[PDB]
Structure formats: C-alpha cells, structure tokens
C-alpha cells in the first residue's frame, strides 16, 4: 500500500476523463491532466504511475494501448491504481536578507547552486526541473513566471523537483504511432 492508492473515476459528459499517458521503462505515467476533469478530481498529477486500469496491469503497455483501454472502457466507472509522483522530491529553503534561496535556473531547470546559501545547506541539486513552488504548479511556465512566483513567496520556499532526464522523458510528446507505423513499417504486401 505504501505510496499506492485505488481510485474510481467517472467519464464526463463527453466520454472523457482528461488524461494523456505515456509508456516509460515498461510502466505507464501521467503526461497531462486536464484542469477540472474527472482525472483532476481524483488527484491525478503529472508523473504519477498508473499500475492498473479496470483490474488489468499496465506493465509493458504502450501509450496507445493505455489510451485504447480507456477509450473503449465499457463502464461509465473506471478504476485505477496509482503510485503518487514517484520521481518528485521536496526541498524546503529559506530566503536570505536579499530575498533569495541560492540557485540559478533556466527553462525551469536548476543549473547552479550558490555556496553557503539555503539551497546549499539543504543539498539542492542541479540537472533537476522544478515542478511546484509553495503549492503552485510551475510545469510549463516561463522562467519570468517562475521568477515572479519566487519573488512573491514568503521566507519559506518549498519546491518539488525531479531529475531533468526523467522530466524530459515524461513531458516529451510522441508523434502519433499512426505516423510512426507509416514511416517504420514500409514493407509492401505484394
């Protein structure tokens, strides 16, 4: 049970739950959750791992397979087993007299730590993407937007981070396989 819960969702009026999933290392992960969706209401988050859908194990499923199963799910009612944000970690820092915690970032990724800052003391790492600051999601925001959130924060700055190589793999959108097939499997029948 640790870090794992079972949820029940119901498709909305349009037959949707508000997800895009992605196959990574023989698991299925949440790539996108739509705001004000069935999926958002049961607390699905970017980077969550989906272990089962409607009693079936997701292990080894392609993105296409997972989407197909949800699309073709006969019930209004859908069960999922979720492992919550496995690749995220939380770091809490405190602003100095200039209002800073001590790290340099670009494109949402931490690239340098200032020695003897709060970030240093708390062991913040580079090559990590910021996911949330003080409860506000920053995935997809511009650096100026991130800067504004940090600026307006109080002294206590609690961030979640994820290794950049994992983040990039989860967020990266694949071509339709439709196209990948067309281009991969070019073998004439006759």
């Amino acid at each position: 049970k640790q870090g794992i819960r079972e949820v029940i969702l119901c498709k909305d009026q349009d037959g949707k739950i508000g997800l895009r999933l992605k196959s990574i290392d023989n698991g299925i992960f949440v790539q996108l959750v739509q705001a004000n969706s069935p999926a958002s209401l049961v607390g699905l988050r970017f980077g969550d791992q989906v272990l089962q859908i409607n009693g079936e194990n997701c292990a080894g499923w392609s993105s296409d397979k997972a989407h197909k199963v949800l699309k073709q799910a006969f019930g209004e009612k859908i069960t999922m087993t979720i492992r919550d944000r496995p690749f995220e970690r939380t770091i809490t820092m405190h602003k100095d007299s200039t209002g800073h915690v001590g790290f340099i970032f670009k494109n949402g990724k931490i690239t340098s730590i200032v020695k003897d800052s709060s970030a240093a003391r708390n062991g913040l790492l580079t090559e990590h993407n910021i996911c949330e600051i003080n409860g506000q999601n920053v995935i997809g925001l511009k650096d100026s937007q991130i800067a504004d959130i940090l600026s307006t924060s109080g002294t206590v700055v609690t961030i979640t981070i994820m290794p950049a190589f994992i983040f990039e793999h989860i967020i990266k959108r694949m071509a339709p396989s439709i196209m990948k097939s067309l281009m991969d499997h070019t073998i004439p029948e006759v």
Binding site: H100, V101, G102, F103, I104, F105, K106, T111, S112, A119, D143, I146, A147, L150, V157
Partner: peptide
C-alpha cells in the same frame, strides 16, 4: 558559458 539565467 551559460547565459541569460535566473537567480532564485
């Protein structure tokens, strides 16, 4: 060298 980075 890195350029146009942001300090937090």
């Amino acid at each position: 060298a890195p350029t146009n980075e942001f300090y937090a």
